[PDB]
């Protein structure tokens, strides 16, 4: 019904009718819906790791000689924020062009010729996270501890907002 906070994994038997059965061979979910639960689970893991940065930045400022580890803030941004932004963009793509993005147009390639992730209803939330990445990097260069904390909070609100409007089908295959 929801996705695990850390692992991100998902948390009726009729004859002649799929009846949205969870059991395999009775599953009514499309491969697109299964791809959407995967992307949503990956969005869930990255957003739930935003609290971990907030704690690290608080430990940095409380230290006797406060210093901002540009390397930690930039490495967390490289490891979690790129993940979250790319996954949000992919969810937006699958929503905008439907099956075409699930492999219906072939191997991922340049000149995709499918509806872009931009112009999606949920794309505005992806723009908020892109601003959050820029703030996390700008604050780290500046040395502003408060800037990193709020920017991570802005990303956390945006990712939670995305999932709520997305209403991703949770599929236990
Ligand atoms: C065995 C290796 C393996 C495994 C387990 C996965 C697993 C995954 N990949 Mg990866 N991937 C792999 C190899 C693998 N990949 C390779 C080699 C490539 C390069 C071609 C990719 C390229 C790739 C991309 C580009 C994407 C994934 C995605 C995914 C996720 C969703 C699965 C999916 O899209 O199925 C989709 C499967 C198909 C479209 C067809 C494959 C054939 C199916 C699985 C078998 C059906 C059997 C059927 C019942 C019998 C025949 C029926 C008859 C009618 C024909 C999942 C985490 C997606 C994702 O969400 O991750 C971000 C995604 O966007 N993968
Ligand atoms: C609980 C165990 C379990 C089991 C037995 C299956 C069984 C299956 N899955 Mg599912 N799946 C599961 C959990 C499970 N799934 C979970 C937890 C996820 C992540 C959300 C997925 C995501 C997933 C994707 C994205 C795809 C499958 C597919 C498949 C089929 C594999 C076809 C093949 O061999 O090639 C098969 C019906 C493939 C499918 O639909 O082929 C019909 C496929 O593309 N699975
Ligand atoms: C290489 C040949 C083998 C793969 C052929 C199928 C690839 C495909 O369908 O595109 C890949 C697509 C998804 O790729 C989608 O493509 C779109 C453009 O058409 C966009 O680029 C989307 O961003 C992208 O997600 O389907 C899959 O996710 C396949 C996942 C792996 C399935 C199991 C392995 C199959 C190959 C085993 C070897």
Residue numbers in the entry: 56 to 66, 73 to 234
Paper lines:
Photosynthetic cryptophytes are eukaryotic algae that utilize membrane-embedded chlorophyll a/c binding proteins (CACs) and lumen-localized phycobiliproteins (PBPs) as their light-harvesting antennae. Here, we solved four structures of cryptophyte PSI-CAC complexes purified from Rhodomonas salina (Rs) cells grown at L- and S-phase. The R. salina cells grown for six and 12 days (corresponding to L-phase and S-phase) were harvested, and utilized to isolate PSI-CAC complexes. We then solved four structures of PSI-CAC complexes purified from cells in both growth phases, containing either 14 or 11 CACs, and termed them as PSI-14CACL-phase and PSI-11CACL-phase for L-phase models, and PSI-14CACS-phase and PSI-11CACS-phase for S-phase models. Comparison of the four structures reveals how cryptophytes adjust their PSI antennae in response to the different growth state.
Local refinement targeting the PsaQ in PSI-14CACL-phase was performed, resulting in a final local map with the resolution of 3.5 Å. Based on our high-quality cryo-EM map and transcriptome sequencing results, we determined the identity of the lumen-localized protein, which is an uncharacterized yet highly conserved protein in cryptophytes. The overall folding of this protein is similar to the PSII extrinsic subunit PsbQ. PsaQ contains four helices and harbors two chlorophyll molecules. One chlorophyll (Chl a323) is coordinated by the C-terminal residue N234, while the other (Chl a322) is presumably coordinated by a water molecule. PsaQ possesses a long loop between helix 2 and 3 (2/3-loop) which, together with the two chlorophylls, inserts into the membrane plane at the interfacial region between CAC-i and PsaB. Moreover, the N-terminal fragment of PsaQ fills in the gap between CAC-i and CAC-h. Multiple hydrogen bond interactions between PsaQ and CAC-i/PsaB tether the PsaQ protein to the lumen surface of thylakoid membrane. Our structure showed that Chls a322/a323 of PsaQ are in close proximity to Chls a616/a606 in CAC-i and Chl a816 in PsaB. PsaQ is unique to cryptophytes and the chlorophyll-coordinating residue N234 is extremely conserved in PsaQ homologs, suggesting that PsaQ and the bound chlorophylls are crucial for the proper functioning of cryptophyte cells during L-phase.
